[PDB]
Every structure is written in structure tokens, then in C-alpha cells.
Design a protein around this nucleic acid. Structure first.
Ligand SMILES: Nc1ncnc2c1ncn2[C@H]1C[C@H](O)[C@@H](COP(=O)(O)NP(=O)(O)OP(=O)(O)O)O1
Ligand SMILES: [Mg+2]
Ligand SMILES: [Mg+2]
Length: 427
DNA sequence: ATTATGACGCT
DNA sequence: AGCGTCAT
């Protein structure tokens, strides 16, 4: 009764850019705006691999991971923008910099956790509290929420904007606005703030985004995807039972892989809500103490993972695959590509040191061998004492050379190289 | 020949 | 420390 926590203590948003790399290229090249459009890396092999797709192109069935040549079969008028290529490899600098633009705007409103190049979590609890204190007894107008969906509404007694507004009206009509500690009210004020953040992002960058507002990161992330693009979705604690009743387990963050599959197989269920029928000890018994307790709370809409105060990446890496016949088979080849990777890594480390007052102290070198399906076949580290590309590539070769069975020749051929700078200290 | 690259858990 | 999992 009065002692069961309900996970309504926080307001958390997840903001995620709509077709991010495509919008970066469309801002730069107005000819691509409002068109079926995709971003591709490389070109020789089947026209290049697609990594981002405009919503106009998605309507034709173009998806991420598709070869551009195949995408053209689905969408003959597809426009393409190519990732910059430097030193023989794709270079993602333009998108990292555009990402920094967005994260810096978001960080004016609240502490953010950078969750990926185009998304960040926002802990709005304090901001909601402040805004409720200035704005006491003021009813919240639908005009303050022009792009907000309320998940689960309308219910009860033909066009999508009509539905959105009817749901929003039901929600606001039902609100108890003179209760400063009401969770539903807090979420609503959170959504007002997220509307403002999103307007600021679009004003100052040209980029559109979607957002989820809920009481934790998992629900905010799930909410965000419910009405992409260019919209935001509020998922309340009370909406959770119906929402989870038909929600495939795999749609919840961290359950999209083997663990989620095990939950489905061992328990013989399909939807997140079915998890409520198990005791905490049962879930721990199958999936471990940590996972069991997490699942027990998550299926009830309760999650406690904090929004970490971290706007900057914790590692700086460069990787390249060498698929099929292009696998690296000579010592010279391995060293040349280590140098290329190391030169890009140096350029990025030096900019990072000047911008963020920190220095990496460890270099992690990882490789994949022809035939091994695993992402990394071998990982080894060494000290990172100087931002010097020749030294870093030489040290990486020193740390991997004894993986070579026998040569001038390298065997088995290398299908991936990866250099990653880690363990930053302030400087 | 799904590429580049992040975060974090396990032992 | 090195490997595995999950993610965009
Ligand atoms: N598997 C992958 N490999 C490489 N780059 C990837 C990637 N997944 C994403 N990216 C890159 C390219 C993407 O532009 C960017 C953000 O990924 P999303 O947020 O998953 N997708 P987007 O923002 O494009 O569309 P939406 O509106 O549905 O959110 O990261
Ligand atoms: Mg996105
Ligand atoms: Mg994203």
C-alpha cells in the first residue's frame, strides 16, 4: 500500500535527432532537403553501405545497412550523401561536431548524459520543480505542448493531429494542477520544458528531433520512438500496464539481445507486462540477482539508473574493417593501416586535449582474424604517453605482432583494426 | 562485404 | 586485464 515505491520520483527525458546524419547533410546541401535521401559510406562495393535514411526514403523501404545499389532498386530517385573519407577510411568528424552543437544547447537546460552521437538523457526533476514554483496554480495550456503526444490517450468517447489534440485535451482536463508533488503534473511540466529545448535546438541548428518524457531512462527512450519524427511523447506511470501488455520484450533497452531472448525462451512469454506474474526471486533465479531485480521493477515501469552527468565521450577510437579479399595479409599492410588509424586518432586526441582539458593515458589495440565471427578477436593495451601517430602505431604493432603465425607475411589475415584511447586524466 | 564506434558487465 | 553483451 503506502510503502511500495512507484518509480515516480524523477522526470527524465530522452532526446534523439531525426535521421541525424541525413539532416546534417541536408543543412549543408539544400538540394537534398525534403527529398528521399540517405548517407552512405564507401562506394565501390555495391554503391556503398547506407547508415542513415530520410523519412521520405524510408517510405520506399530504404533502411540502414542496405547497399546503395539495392536501395536504388527500391527508390530510383534516392539522393545520396557520402561520408568524408580521409586516410583511406570513413571520417565521422562532421557528425561529431554537429552532435556537439546539439548537446551544448541541451546542456543549457539541464544535466545531460550523452547516450550516443545523436541522443542524450536529461534529468529534469530540478527544472520541473523550479518551473512549478514560479508557475503556481497556473493551468497548463495545450498551446504550450504543440508537438506532445500522451501515450494511451484518447480513450473512450480520423486524422493524426486530431487524435493528438484529443488525447492532450483529455490529459490536461484530468490534471490536478494545484498539487506540486503530483507525478503526472511533473511529467507535464517536463514536457513543456522539452518542447522549449526542442524549439531551441531547431532554431539554433536547423535540426529536428524527437523526445520521450517519463520517470526513468528506459521509459523515456521507449516513449521517444512512439511518435518520431519531429514529435515528443509523454509516458506516464499509469499508462504502463496497457503499454506493456502488448510490448515485445525486445523493444526495451538492454533486452534486445541474448538476455531478452532467454527471458522469452525460459519463461514462455512475449510481452513485457507478462513479467509481472513472476516473483523477484524467480527472475533472479533465472537471470541473476541484478537482472532479476531489474526485470521485476522494470515490468512495473520502475527503473533507477541515474542520468549520469557526462556530456563528453569516455573513449576516442578509430576502427576499420577489411572484409573478404581485402583482409590484411602482409606486415607492411598492417603497419600502414595502423599508421592511418593512428594519424586520425592523433588529430582527434589533440583537438580533445585543447577543447576539454584532458589527456588519454591508455591505448587499446584490437584486431579481428579472418574467420572469427566475434567483433574483437584479440584486445591488448599499452601506455599512451605522447600524442604521436608514429609512436602509437609502432606501439600497437609491438603489442599485436606476436599474433602473426608466420611470415613479411601476416596470417591469418586481419579483417579489422581498432585503436582506442582510454583512461583520461585532467590536464 | 553490416561499418564505425560507443558504454558497460563478468571474471 | 581481456573478453563478452548491447547499443546507435
Ligand atoms: N549501426 C550503425 N552504424 C553506423 N552508424 C549508425 C548506426 N546506427 C546509427 N548510426 C548513425 C547514423 C544515424 O544518423 C545516427 C543516429 O542513429 P539513430 O538515432 O539510430 N537513427 P537516425 O537518427 O538516423 O534516425 P531516427 O530518426 O530513426 O532516430 O547514428
Ligand atoms: Mg535518431
Ligand atoms: Mg539515436
Amino acid at each position: 500500500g503506502p510503502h511500495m515505491a512507484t518509480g515516480q520520483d524523477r522526470v527524465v527525458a530522452l532526446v534523439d535527432m531525426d535521421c541525424f546524419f541525413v539532416q546534417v547533410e541536408q543543412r549543408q546541401n539544400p538540394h537534398l532537403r525534403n527529398k528521399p535521401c540517405a548517407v552512405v559510406q564507401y562506394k565501390s562495393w555495391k554503391g556503398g553501405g547506407i547508415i542513415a535514411v530520410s523519412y521520405e526514403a524510408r517510405a520506399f523501404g530504404v533502411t540502414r545497412s542496405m547497399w546503395a545499389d539495392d536501395a536504388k532498386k527500391l527508390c530510383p530517385d534516392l539522393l545520396l550523401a557520402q561520408v568524408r573519407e580521409s586516410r583511406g577510411k570513413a571520417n565521422l568528424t562532421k557528425y561529431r561536431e554537429a552532435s556537439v552543437e546539439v548537446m551544448e544547447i541541451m546542456s543549457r537546460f539541464a544535466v545531460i548524459e550523452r547516450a550516443a552521437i545523436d541522443e542524450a538523457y536529461v534529468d529534469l526533476t530540478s527544472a520541473v520543480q523550479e518551473r512549478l514554483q514560479k508557475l503556481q496554480g497556473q493551468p497548463i495550456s495545450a498551446d504550450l505542448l504543440p508537438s506532445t503526444y500522451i501515450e494511451g490517450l484518447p480513450q473512450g468517447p480520423v486524422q493524426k493531429e486530431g487524435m493528438r489534440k484529443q488525447g492532450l485535451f483529455q490529459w490536461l482536463d484530468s490534471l490536478q494542477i494545484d498539487n506540486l508533488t503530483s507525478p503526472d503534473l511533473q511529467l507535464t511540466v517536463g514536457a513543456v520544458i522539452v518542447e522549449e529545448m526542442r524549439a531551441a535546438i531547431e532554431r539554433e541548428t536547423g535540426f529536428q528531433c524527437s523526445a520521450g518524457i517519463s520517470h526513468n531512462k528506459v521509459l523515456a527512450k521507449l516513449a521517444c520512438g512512439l511518435n518520431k519524427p519531429n514529435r515528443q511523447t509523454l509516458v506516464s506511470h499509469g499508462s504502463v500496464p496497457q503499454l506493456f501488455s502488448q510490448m515485445p520484450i525486445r523493444k526495451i533497452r538492454s533486452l534486445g539481445g541474448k538476455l531478452g531472448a532467454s527471458v522469452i525462451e525460459i519463461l514462455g512469454i512475449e510481452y513485457m507486462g507478462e513479467l509481472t506474474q513472476f516473483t523477484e526471486s524467480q527472475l533472479q533465479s533465472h537471470f541473476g540477482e541484478k537482472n532479476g531485480s531489474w526485470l521485476y521493477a522494470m515490468c512495473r515501469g520502475i527503473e533507477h539508473d541515474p542520468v549520469k552527468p557526462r556530456q563528453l565521450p569516455k573513449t576516442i577510437g578509430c576502427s576499420k574493417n577489411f572484409p573478404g579479399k581485402t583482409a590484411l595479409a602482409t606486415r607492411e599492410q598492417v603497419q600502414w593501416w595502423l599508421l592511418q588509424l593512428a594519424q586520425e586518432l592523433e588529430e582527434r586526441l589533440t583537438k580533445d586535449r585543447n577543447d576539454n582539458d584532458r589527456v588519454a593515458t591508455q591505448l587499446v589495440v584490437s584486431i579481428r582474424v579472418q574467420g572469427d565471427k566475434r567483433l574483437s578477436s584479440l584486445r591488448r593495451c599499452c601506455a599512451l604517453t605522447r600524442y604521436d601517430a608514429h609512436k602509437m602505431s609502432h606501439d600497437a604493432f609491438t603489442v599485436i605482432k606476436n599474433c602473426n603465425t608466420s611470415g613479411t607475411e601476416w596470417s591469418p589475415p586481419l579483417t579489422m583494426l581498432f585503436l582506442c584511447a582510454t583512461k583520461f586524466s585532467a590536464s
